[PDB]
């Protein structure tokens, strides 16, 4: 049975950084050579295992995650390193098996007025435990005063969107990114 991973890759809508889409694969077969070869996605560099050996590896289940980030953020998305988005929004637990896909679909991503549907989160009390999201609209107070849960000078609203446009410098236009993880369970591996 062919897997819908190609469907997930070829998807009109990706969710923003603060809430990333997640898909799972069951009782199915996925030809990875379609990702291995040339794709409309330019970059295939990733760390999990040796990519060629993937065929003979027995694996239980597959996790699919996609989002839209910036070009420089694509550099920092890699695990084992600290960034403002990675420490606060999306953290990769080190030693994970599976790997990353990167590219720039600027043609669809860019919008004449600015595609502001994409959002990020830059205000939090502490760091983020890997593989965990906090989609909270709660008003954030940092200084001494609690603000009474209302907009104020010291406290701030943590959520705010990007600024896009059809023509822009390279590395700053939005980049659509999908990542996957591989693991083993005691159950019969349905791959």
């Amino acid at each position: 049975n062919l897997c819908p991973f190609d469907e997930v890759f070829n998807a009109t809508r990706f969710a923003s950084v603060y809430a990333w889409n997640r898909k799972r694969i069951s009782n199915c077969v996925a030809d990875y050579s379609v990702l291995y070869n040339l794709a409309p996605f330019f970059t295939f560099k990733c760390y999990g295992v040796s990519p060629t050996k993937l065929n003979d590896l027995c694996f239980t289940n597959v996790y699919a995650d996609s989002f839209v980030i910036r070009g420089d953020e694509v550099r920092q998305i890699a695990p084992g390193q600290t960034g403002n988005i990675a420490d606060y929004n999306y953290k990769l637990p080190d030693d994970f098996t599976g790997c990353v896909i990167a590219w720039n679909s600027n043609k669809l991503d860019s919008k004449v007025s600015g595609n502001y549907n994409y959002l990020y989160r830059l205000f939090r009390k502490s760091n983020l435990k890997p593989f965990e999201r906090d989609i909270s609209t709660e008003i954030y107070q940092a200084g001494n005063k609690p603000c009474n849960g209302v907009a104020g000078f010291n406290c701030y609203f943590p959520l705010r969107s990007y600024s896009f446009r059809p023509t822009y410098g390279v590395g700053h236009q939005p980049y659509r990114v999908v990542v996957l993880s591989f693991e083993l369970l005691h159950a019969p591996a349905t791959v």
Epitope: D87, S126, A142, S163, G169, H172
Partner: single-chain antibody, 222 residues
Framework: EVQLLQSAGGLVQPGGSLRLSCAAS????????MSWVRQAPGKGLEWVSV???????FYADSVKGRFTISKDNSKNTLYLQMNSLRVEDTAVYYC????????????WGQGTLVTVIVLTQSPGTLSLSPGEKATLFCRAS???????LAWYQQKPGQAPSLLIY???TRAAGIPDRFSGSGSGTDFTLTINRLEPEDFAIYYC??????????FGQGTRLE
């Protein structure tokens, strides 16, 4: 009425270590970002270090290492550890807080001097009698966003502050003289009327393009 106090100095001849106590009121170091910017004597001021809430910290690209910024929530005092230095390190050191979207380097202390995308300001240095409209233009290279622009006021003997944070909406204490509007890569800084405190040096500013923040050399307006 958030305020800031710190003190250091001396060291005409080399001293390996030096620690200045940035002590704050109205906010905590663990609350938000903390930043440092040093201004060389009669030269451009550049970014050196910012700590991120939760522990993470980045240092200046020009000189990796040899510094150590530590965040103390116990004292509410920020310290910046030195190992040892050489010449050209000397400059007035400012500790400041930033949020980079609705305010860029909003509140600064008073600072003191230790001792041992590019923005180019096309108009240059202008001297002019009071009562005439003036303009300033900031030139870039990577055609970045209007929302990432900031502009600053500096007066001799006064620690520099901000006037507009996003380049479109003026910050607290709006002047009906300055204005912010930009097209393409060049963002216009036009001035209506000249005041004695208005005759001063100004720096174009860019934030958020990278964790490191770049400044311009500055131009003299009077």
């Amino acid at each position: 009425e958030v305020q800031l106090l710190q003190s250091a100095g001396g060291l005409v001849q080399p001293g390996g270590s030096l620690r200045l106590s940035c002590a704050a009121s109205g906010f905590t170091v663990s609350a938000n970002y903390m930043s440092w910017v040093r201004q060389a004597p009669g030269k451009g001021l550049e970014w050196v270090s910012v700590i991120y809430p939760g522990g993470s910290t980045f240092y200046a690209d020009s000189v990796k290492g040899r510094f150590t910024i530590s965040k103390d929530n116990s004292k509410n005092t920020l310290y910046l550890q030195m190992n040892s230095l050489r010449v050209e390190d000397t400059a007035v050191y400012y500790c400041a807080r930033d949020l980079s979207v609705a305010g860029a380097f909003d509140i600064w202390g008073q600072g003191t001097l230790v001792t041992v995308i590019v923005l180019t300001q096309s108009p240059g240095t202008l001297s002019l009698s009071p009562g005439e409209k003036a303009t300033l233009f900031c030139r870039a290279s990577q055609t970045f966003s209007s929302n990432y622009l900031a502009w600053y006021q500096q007066k001799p003997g006064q620690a520099p502050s901000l006037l507009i944070y996003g380049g479109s909406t003026r910050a607290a204490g709006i002047p009906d003289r300055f204005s912010g509007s930009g097209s393409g890569t060049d963002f216009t800084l036009t001035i209506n009327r000249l005041e004695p405190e208005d005759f001063a040096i100004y720096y174009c500013q860019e934030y958020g393009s990278s964790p490191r923040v770049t400044f311009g050399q500055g131009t003299r307006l009077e």
